Amino acid sequence: SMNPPPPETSNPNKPKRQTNQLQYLLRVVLKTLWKHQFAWPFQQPVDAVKLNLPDYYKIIKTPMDMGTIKKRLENNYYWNAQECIQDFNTMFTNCYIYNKPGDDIVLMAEALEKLFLQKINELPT
Ligand SMILES: COCC(COC)n1c(-c2cc(C)c(=O)n(C)c2)nc2cc(N3CCOCC3)ccc21
């Protein structure tokens, strides 16, 4: 059991643009979640070898983490704000698929998801 390569943070065969929404997702949404006290388990891909979680990448076939989302925003990987919001949703959903109710990681995901929703609420037009 080993780790997959992390998600792509670059697509050479994809146009790029700067929008108010993408800038807000990096500078306000991601930055706010990144600095939250419960951010640390979500700042990098799950390392199944280091943490000894051999069934993680048997159960989770669409991994996502805030380190990947950060790099995607910084590299102008996303064309649509929807793509970035979908990646956050995937990250939270994976946590609820793999882990059990009352697990520390699940209550941490709940706290971050609540904050995420409050910040996306004020996403500009
Ligand atoms: C609160 O989460 C605890 C779990 C423990 O998994 C066995 N965990 C995850 C983790 C995260 C997610 C989203 C998940 O689903 N699982 C199962 C584990 N990522 C981690 C990273 C670290 N370290 C801290 C020191 O620096 C290196 C990294 C330490 C613990 C971690």
DSSP code per residue over 41-85? GGSS---TTTTT-TTHHHH-SS---HHHHHHHHHTT--SSHHHHH
Domain positions in the chain are 19-123
* CA–CA dist 34, 17 (Å, integer): 24
Q: H/E element holding 105?
A: helix 104-120
Nearest-atom index, ligand 1, CA of 94: 15
Q: Under 8 Å CB-to-CB from 56, ≥6 apart: which residues?
A: 46, 48, 98
The experimental method, as deposited, was: X-ray
Residue 46 Cα to ligand 1 middle (Å): 7
Resolution attained, angstroms: 1.3
Contact (CB, 8 A) for 43 and 65: yes
| CA dist 13 → 74, 101, 116 (Å) | 17, 41, 30
Q: Ligand 1 atom 18: the closest Cα is on which residue?
A: 46
CB 123 within 8 A of CB 21: yes
List the residue whose alpha carbon is closest to atom 21 of ligand 1.
41
How many angstroms separate the CA atoms of 19 and 22, rounded? 5
Which residues contact ligand 1 via a Cβ below 6 A? 41-42, 46, 51, 53, 95, 98-99, 104-105, 108
Measured between alpha carbons, how far is 68 from 103 in angstroms, rounded to an integer? 24
Fold of the domain built from segment(s) 19-123: Histone Acetyltransferase; Chain A (1.20.920)
CA dist 86 and 93 (Å) reads 10
Report d(CA 16, CA 33) in Å as an integer: 25
CB atoms within 10 A of CB 119: 16
Taking CA atoms only, the protein residue closest to ligand 1 atom 15 is 95
Contact 112, 96 (CB under 8 A): no
Angle at 48 between CA 43 and CA 53, to 5 degrees: 120
CA distance 46 to 63: 8
